[PDB]
Amino acid sequence: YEQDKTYKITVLHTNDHHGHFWRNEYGEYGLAAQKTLVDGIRKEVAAEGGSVLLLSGGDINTGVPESDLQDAEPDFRGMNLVGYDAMAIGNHEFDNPLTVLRQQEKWAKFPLLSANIYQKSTGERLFKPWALFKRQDLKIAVIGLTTDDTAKIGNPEYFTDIEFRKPADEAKLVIQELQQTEKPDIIIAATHMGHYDNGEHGSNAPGDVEMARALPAGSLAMIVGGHSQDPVCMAAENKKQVDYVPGTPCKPDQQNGIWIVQAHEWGKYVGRADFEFRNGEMKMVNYQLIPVNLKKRVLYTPEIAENQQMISLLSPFQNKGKAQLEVKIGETNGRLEGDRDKVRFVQTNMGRLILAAQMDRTGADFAVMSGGGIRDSIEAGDISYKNVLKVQPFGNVVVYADMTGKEVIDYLTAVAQMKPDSGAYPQFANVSFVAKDGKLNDLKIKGEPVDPAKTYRMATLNFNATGGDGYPRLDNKPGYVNTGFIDAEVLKAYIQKSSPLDVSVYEPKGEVSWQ
Ligand SMILES: [Zn+2]
Ligand SMILES: [Zn+2]
């Protein structure tokens, strides 16, 4: 770089896109509006003589039927047109077989990076640890890191000959490899690790804050994060704002001299970190989260028109995905009861089917949900995704919690207090008991009495886990995991691999009763 030269570098970033290539029902977000915004900032910065780098914290896959059904092809192609420079590989990039991820890599014109994912048998990295970019005469290195909880979470399916090594330890090695071989002027890490207040990751794998603290002070200009899905805007030292409001100031976190940022999820924001580099020092001059047509429905900020080129590119995928919703995914030999006056009074086969799908996705031992969360029945016969979405129309997310036998007792006793004839009435799976005077007698999980000294995994929805319907909160306790899997997708996928469904398998036989 030139001595005494001041370079202006703008780093734009997004993360946890999760299939949101299209605008939602309220005209919010989508990649067509993102394109207009990013093109605009590039024009602005080009005119100021600066440089732009657009990075993704990963998790492009999974979360919207039209995307999921096409293996996120529209999302990666859309990202090509928005012009991403690089992306960190996220844990959801492994929801599909490696063949699909390699296909996504072929689609993407930008590198999919990760320094810590290794092939077990050879000890060699599966992907590139970093990408180098020339901007003016600066050499900028972007390293990628992926959470090492990836293969440990839920019910893992595709990690044949693959392992995830500790991200923070790999970052130390990678930074040193780069300094000794490339001597980049600036190093930024795109990570899919999570931002936890004051590094309080709990049962989750250590994330961005603990890593920044472990690295040499200021060794990275910034960590462009993801996974935890939060707009990282600080209210107080080591404390993220709760209920951050679109369009308001956003102070990114700074730990051990390293800036840590995150733009929430689904293309809701494009983070913009404006830096000035001169004689080796990287100074953040400005930071903001720029909403992409977010609404409270009224806009918070100026409406961003959807780029026509993006709409023409994405429309066929949107249309094809919508039409695919009509297609038969399975069949049932009997009506699956989801009617309100049944699911709010007694255990039903639809409740058992949904919970069976959730336990299967999460590796859970038992599960529960509110009868009020089942919104329709499915008649005997063919089943389409469209049928599934009417049963599960609200996009609740499947989550699980590992708990002690004692906690299970306390948890189920509390939930059993929810009365029939209310949306809060519970649908259970793999739970049996007779409730008498607020007490649960002969309590069993999978036919075995509960052992206070054992650990059990329970599946449910985020709605319930965070206290919905008066259920005990699980989200703020260790062992909690929000999987990011949407209720409808989990049910559709389970029905699809399980069909033809013999519904007698899901018929309640009095496992739980009240008297
Ligand atoms: Zn995610
Ligand atoms: Zn993730």
Inter-CA distances, 109 with 10, 301, 414, Å? 21, 31, 52
Alpha carbon distance 36, 305 (integer Å): 7
In the numeric block, the tokens 């909690």 are attached to 480
Strand duo 455-461 + 397-404: pairing: antiparallel
By C-alpha distance, which of 394, 373, 401 is closest to 459?
401
The CA radius of gyration of the chain, in Å to the nearest whole number, is 24
* Token representation of residue 84: 């991403």
Alpha carbon distance 410, 67 (integer Å): 40
Which parts are annotated binding residues for substrate? 340-344, 463-469
Q: How far is CA 421 from the centre of its chain?
A: 34
Q: How far is CA 333 from the centre of its chain?
A: 35
Distance 183 CA to ligand 1 centre (A): 32
Write the DSSP symbol of residue 450.
-
| Identified catalytic residue from 201, 344, 352, 457 | 344
Inter-CA distances, 388 with 207, 367, 434, 486, Å? 35, 19, 32, 12
Q: What is the dihedral of CA 166, 168, 169, 173, to 10 degrees?
A: 130
Burial of 24-47, coded b for 16+ CB within 10 Å and e otherwise, reads eeeebbbbbbbbbbbbebbeebee
Q: Which superfamily, per CATH, for 1-327?
A: Metallo-dependent phosphatases (3.60.21.10)
328-515: which CATH topology?
5'-nucleotidase;  domain 2 (3.90.780)
The widest CA-to-CA distance across the chain, in whole angstroms, is 82
The CA-based angle 139-141-146, given to 5 degrees, is 175
Write the DSSP symbol of residue 335.
-
The domain segmentation of the chain, as residue ranges, is 1-327, 328-515
| Identified catalytic residue from 95, 360, 402, 487 | 95
Q: What ligand is nearest to the CA atom of residue 230?
A: 1
| Catalytic residue list contains 59 | yes
| Catalytic residue list contains 473 | no
- Resolution as reported, in Å: 1.7
Element (H, E) at 346: none
Write the DSSP symbol of residue 65.
H
Distance 91 CA to ligand 2 centre (A): 5
Q: Give the torsion sign (CA, 229, 233, 239, 242).
A: negative
Element (H, E) at 440: strand 439-445
Alpha carbon distance 117, 104 (integer Å): 17
Q: What ligand is nearest to the CA atom of residue 89?
A: 2
In the numeric block, the tokens 């209210």 are attached to 235
Alpha carbon distance 275, 270 (integer Å): 16
Alpha carbon distance 146, 165 (integer Å): 9
| Catalytic residue list contains 361 | no
Q: Is omega for the bond preceding 500 within 30 degrees of 0, making it cis?
A: yes
Q: How far is CA 6 from the centre of its chain?
A: 38
The CA-based angle 371-440-430, given to 5 degrees, is 55
Transcribe 229-271 into DSSP letters.
--B--EEETTEE-SSPPTTS----EEETTEEEE-B-STTSEEE
Amino acid letter, residue 454: K
Asked if 435 and 401 touch (Cβ cutoff 8 Å), the reply is no
* Token representation of residue 414: 């509390």
| Catalytic residue list contains 34 | no
Distance 111 CA to ligand 1 centre (A): 19
Which parts are annotated binding residues? 16, 18, 59, 91, 192, 227, 229, 340-344, 463-469
Write the DSSP symbol of residue 472.
P
Asked if 135 and 53 touch (Cβ cutoff 8 Å), the reply is yes
Q: How far is CA 37 from the centre of its chain?
A: 23
Inter-CA distances, 103 with 28, 54, 99, 189, 317, Å? 29, 22, 6, 24, 17
| Catalytic residue list contains 297 | no
| Identified catalytic residue from 20, 59, 293, 462 | 59
Element (H, E) at 400: strand 397-404
Q: What is the dihedral of CA 442, 407, 346, 508, to 10 degrees?
A: -60
Alpha carbon distance 278, 275 (integer Å): 10
Distance 262 CA to ligand 2 centre (A): 12
In the numeric block, the tokens 């299939």 are attached to 19
In the numeric block, the tokens 């999987």 are attached to 483
| Catalytic residue list contains 278 | no
Write the DSSP symbol of residue 421.
S
| Catalytic residue list contains 77 | no
> Which contacts (CB < 8 Å, 24+ apart) does range 385-390 have?
385/65, 385/69, 385/324, 385/325, 385/327, 385/329, 385/488, 385/492, 386/325, 386/326, 388/329, 388/488, 388/491, 388/492, 388/495, 389/65, 389/325, 389/488
Alpha carbon distance 477, 31 (integer Å): 35
Q: How far is CA 67 from the centre of its chain?
A: 14
How many CB atoms sit inside 10 A of residue 513's CB?
A: 13
| Catalytic residue list contains 319 | no
Strand ranges across the sheet with 222-224:
130-135, 138-146, 186-192, 222-224, 258-261, 253-255
Alpha carbon distance 141, 127 (integer Å): 15
Amino acid letter, residue 206: P
In the chain, what is the straight-line distance between the N-terminal and C-terminal CA atoms, in Å? Answer: 79
In the numeric block, the tokens 């590119």 are attached to 313
3-state secondary structure 101-161: HHHHHHHCCCCEECCCEEECCCCEECCECEEEEEECCEEEEEEEEECCCCCCCCCCCCCCC
DSSP-derived 3-state class of residue 378: strand
| Catalytic residue list contains 192 | yes
DSSP-derived 3-state class of residue 208: helix
Distance 29 CA to ligand 2 centre (A): 20
349 CB-near residues (< 8 Å, 6+ apart): 334, 336, 337, 503, 506, 507, 508
Alpha carbon distance 312, 92 (integer Å): 27
| Catalytic residue list contains 335 | no
Asked if 377 and 348 touch (Cβ cutoff 8 Å), the reply is no
| Catalytic residue list contains 195 | no
Which parts are annotated binding residues for Zn(2+)? 16, 18, 59, 91, 192, 227, 229
Write the DSSP symbol of residue 197.
G
DSSP-derived 3-state class of residue 305: coil
Q: Can you name the residues that pair with 383 across neighbouring β-strands? A: 330
Q: What ligand is nearest to the CA atom of residue 205?
A: 2
290 CB-near residues (< 8 Å, 6+ apart): 37, 269, 270, 271, 272, 301
Alpha carbon distance 489, 65 (integer Å): 7
Q: Can you name the residues that pair with 286 across neighbouring β-strands? A: 274
Q: How far is CA 154 from the centre of its chain?
A: 13
* Token representation of residue 190: 């795109």
Q: For 179-245, list the strands marked E by DSSP.
A: 186-192, 222-224, 234-236, 239-240
Distance 151 CA to ligand 2 centre (A): 12
Q: Work out the angle between the directed axes of helices 73-82 and 308-324 (0-180°, nearest 10).
A: 170
Write the DSSP symbol of residue 461.
E
Q: What ligand is nearest to the CA atom of residue 263?
A: 1
| Catalytic residue list contains 71 | no
| Identified catalytic residue from 23, 77, 192, 195 | 192
Q: What is the dihedral of CA 495, 501, 505, 510, to 10 degrees?
A: 70
Distance 68 CA to ligand 1 centre (A): 14
Asked if 21 and 76 touch (Cβ cutoff 8 Å), the reply is no
